Design a protein around this ligand. Sequence first.
Ligand SMILES: OC[C@H]1O[C@](O)(CO)[C@@H](O)[C@@H]1O
Ligand SMILES: OC[C@H]1O[C@](O)(CO)[C@@H](O)[C@@H]1O
Ligand SMILES: [Mn+2]
Ligand SMILES: [Mn+2]
Lengths: 227, 226
Amino acid sequence: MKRSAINDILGHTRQFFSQHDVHLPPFASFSPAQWQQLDTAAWEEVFDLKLGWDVTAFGRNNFAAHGLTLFTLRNGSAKGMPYVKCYAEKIMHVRDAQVTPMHFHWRKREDIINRGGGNLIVELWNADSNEQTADSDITVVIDGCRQKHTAGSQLRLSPGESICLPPGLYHSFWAEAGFGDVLVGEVSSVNDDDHDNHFLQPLDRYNLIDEDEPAQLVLCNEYRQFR
Amino acid sequence: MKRSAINDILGHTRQFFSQHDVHLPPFASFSPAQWQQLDTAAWEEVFDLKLGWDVTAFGRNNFAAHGLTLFTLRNGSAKGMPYVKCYAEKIMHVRDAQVTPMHFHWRKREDIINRGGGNLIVELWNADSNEQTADSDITVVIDGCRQKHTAGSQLRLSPGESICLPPGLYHSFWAEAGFGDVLVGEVSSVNDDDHDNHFLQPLRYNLIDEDEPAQLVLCNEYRQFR
Ligand SMILES: OC[C@H]1O[C@](O)(CO)[C@@H](O)[C@@H]1O
Ligand SMILES: OC[C@H]1O[C@](O)(CO)[C@@H](O)[C@@H]1O
Ligand SMILES: [Mn+2]
Ligand SMILES: [Mn+2]
């Protein structure tokens, strides 16, 4: 991905968030220059837990088809130390027909929430012992309602609705094509994108960046030179 | 507390949520009749974990001065079983200058989030050995920024901002007078209002006068529906 495309994607996403009356903490708008002037001792949690912006094309080269834009609002340490918080929250922008590829988490339990806009389609499979998709029925809770469904069921979450995905449950999601971008909330146990994502297909969760123009914002995986 | 006032409060809060592009799950709008027709086996989690509406005057007689309106969206079991989820989420309506009294939690750690509207003022004190307010400095993290402040500090959360409150940290909050109602988010570890709230001034309870039919069911009155 080009830095220019990342600037453009983030600019559009901030607008989409504003459109839905979503408000972000001040650090969401810090320029790289502003990050450079911070007291690094006070901001360790941001750097350590990778709070902030995340843009990915999932190791492929068509963001519009396979991609996700996220902001990590809060989090705890993967092991529990030194940040004891057991919970994390993200706010995300899923563009019309944009797909997050099939994956499960080893540890993280997450509630994926349609906070507004279009319709979020979520496809679910149990994992078998080979870590492939199994043919067994899935059992999930959608807003406190427990239900069983066929392997590979595609479930529609309308605005307001949420599904709890336990660890080991394979999920893929997209904004239903033509029904508009979706504002997705995720409230979960601690998030660890370095180690806690198992994609059905082998793929890189972060992208390398073609620095073709100056960065307007800093991504959550690139703080290292600001700490 | 009159059901008519509860009906009204909830009606206004639903509009406020809607004006802030907040969308609630289907069960947020179930009438008592609809609750009566649910498959009780499929909905146990709602009942057991007290998901849904909560309206409180904190056992006092002036909702406008001391009160809160909440909707518990998700939760887990106080003791980790049988609902293993470690996290909870509420969305709340804090009316202009309406106060939530000083309290701490034994167990719950919570991020209090200004999701929109006016400004939220949060007052903070460490709890003493005797569960009184201590004079020690407080150490808090506001959106990943760690800072130390004096006992009893009043901190302003503008829309977008959030503060993490560890267990045992006394807190009280209100919408800054004149800046308007605040939409408050709460993302936390498991919520248990039955056992996990210690108010500085102990709470003393209201019952509901059913002067009109209830439009909605509160999270503390599921008893009849399971
Ligand atoms: O790529 C894995 C990504 O998918 C999510 O779990 C959403 O299901 C994100 O929180 C995570 O960063
Ligand atoms: O009743 C005590 C109330 O105070 C809060 O913790 C807000 O800080 C609510 O989550 C809880 O219901
Ligand atoms: Mn996931
Ligand atoms: Mn509290």
